């Protein structure tokens, strides 16, 4: 006698071949429903099966009812069989993998010019410029429905859904069809990756392709250390390139290790690093603003960032951390700092009193500034954000008080017309105060704080965000997922969340998100840059994008997957390393200053050579020698030294000064994480982050956490020469190495 053991012994009837309905397993004393498939587009809740052009695996699971209990089943892989009417060309290797492919006859060679018909004006313009970048040929947009080489068209009906697409290649041209304009955009990514491998020709055949999961995401901690907008748009295009579509951005956070200031005689509430990256009218009675003072986003900048990411299929999800990680808020309202008992009293200043109604009032006001209409924009700043993340990971006080606050902030978003996302913490914070679940998204980041199984039964849509598997803390001893890309690529599946496993077809499973946390910042900051973590961010993407969009099994080895990542290269019109196209040098003998150069910024490795003479060095006045949006090369700083400021706002000093009134030969050597200075051939010093060096001065010993490496990556600015340089520049040379 089985007793909802039935579920792990079920017998799926044959499924015949090319059937229309999923046959159902029957067991005498039990009632058995269909929970769902991993490809809802192939086997729906109603059990109806869609045709396939190539044999595709689908994982179904069930609810077995017998006596008064249930349990959801294990996954059953059925494989929908296609009619093998033909066979032809092999499937093109794409990241992520194409689900279905029917090989065809021959090739479609491209002409000296390419024409494209597209009913989406903004999509068609995007597509054509990505085309010219990859091909080098020049691409024409034709009327939507005129005679063209590649024709994008919106198909009605079908199973594709908002992210599917039918890509068809014949030797008379290419025809991309989708149900929504968003799946048409993913079709371009597939076509562009092929054209990356064979720019002259694409094999004939039909490609039908679906994402297995709805939410394929990357969170970025843009609060503990700054990230310029230009970098975040490199991230949007690189995610779109691997068909990832969820950019979760932490807008406010603060330095974790407030103890470092306490144990050394300082006030963390007064010196710990905190940030709120969005522009805000909010200011405290003491005039202190909520918006971060070193780098922030204006409301229009952010509103435009969200619309840009939507053009490339990515939904930006902004997060406001409360009541924890809220040192930016408590600095406005010290009277709301939680005062109750707690387990690590040295980290109090970052905690809002979630029990105080005058705290929910404040958090609501901050939210409303972006959820309600903005006067200047004529619409909310978060107008294009369907999902807003309300934070709510932890509260040091009563568990019931946490639940009341969690329910307040989740419902605030629901009543303002927004879907909320929350860090799963209800297992850690159980209680009788009801917390809303229907309409609410939850990040399953830790199993001790929220069990995946009890999250789905309480009624949440869940996102695999598991810390042991998907957290990256750059250059840290713990949370180094960037050294496990091989294991992720081979074993990681979205429905296994820590040591729990959901069925891949559970409808409340949205997908998964990997996370980048910048813990070792402030008085621990090594000086690393958004450039310095690009390789692991982009490399985390190219692995997880396969396991999020594709089937449960990697189509190749990790080693083959990485040499395909190389053939396909960066995303169209995306140069995150500022590599130059030709390694010939740039030579300038300036006529007078400032000289305008108008060359692209140059990343490592490079060497800068200049013959110059400093005519004056008034004290306290900065002297910009090289300038571009990526940063400034400071001939003289406020302390008199040579150094530079990056576009992430971190400043660095070489510790050397230029002689006033002397001809000097200046060389600067740019390497990954090392920028070196040589004056007259002699080593003048190596760059050191100056941003948070104070405060930690007088800490003396017992600051075992001072940064032990000094990283100073510097993308060379090359737009204007000698902006505010009080001197002459005789000769200047830039050389990629
Ligand atoms: Mg564009």
Numbering used by the authors: 20 to 756
Quote what the paper states about this structure.
The crystal structure of Am2136 (without signal peptide residues 1–19) in apo form was solved to 2.9 Å. The catalytic domain III was flanked by domain I, II and IV, in which the majority of interdomain contacts were established by the galectin-like domain IV (1099.1 Å2). This galectin-like module adopts a closing hand shape formed by two antiparallel β-sheet sandwiches (β23-β33). It forms several hydrogen bonds (R665-G546/Y547, R730-T545) and a charge–charge interaction (K714-D717) with domain III, by which the extended V-type loop (V707-T732) can participate in the substrate-binding pocket formation. Thus, Y415 is a crucial part of the hydrophobic pocket necessary for substrate binding, this interpretation is further supported by the obvious increased Km value (2.32 mM) of mutant Y415A. Five critical residues (S249, K252, R256, Y550, E649) that form direct interactions with GDP.
Akkermansia muciniphila is an anaerobic intestinal commensal bacterium which possesses specific β-N-acetylhexosaminidases for gut mucosal layer colonization and mucin degradation. In this study, we assessed the in vitro mucin glycan cleavage activity of the A. muciniphila β-N-acetylhexosaminidase Am2136 and demonstrated its ability that hydrolyzing the β-linkages joining N-acetylglucosamine to a wide variety of aglycone residues, which indicated that Am2136 may be a generalist β-N-acetylhexosaminidase. The GH20 family has the largest number of β-N-acetylhexosaminidases, and they generally utilize the substrate-assisted mechanism. Among the known GH20 family members, Am2136 is unique for its possession of additional N-terminal domain (D21-G107) and C-terminal galectin-like domain (D601-L756).20 The galectin-like domain usually acts as a sugar moiety-recognition module.
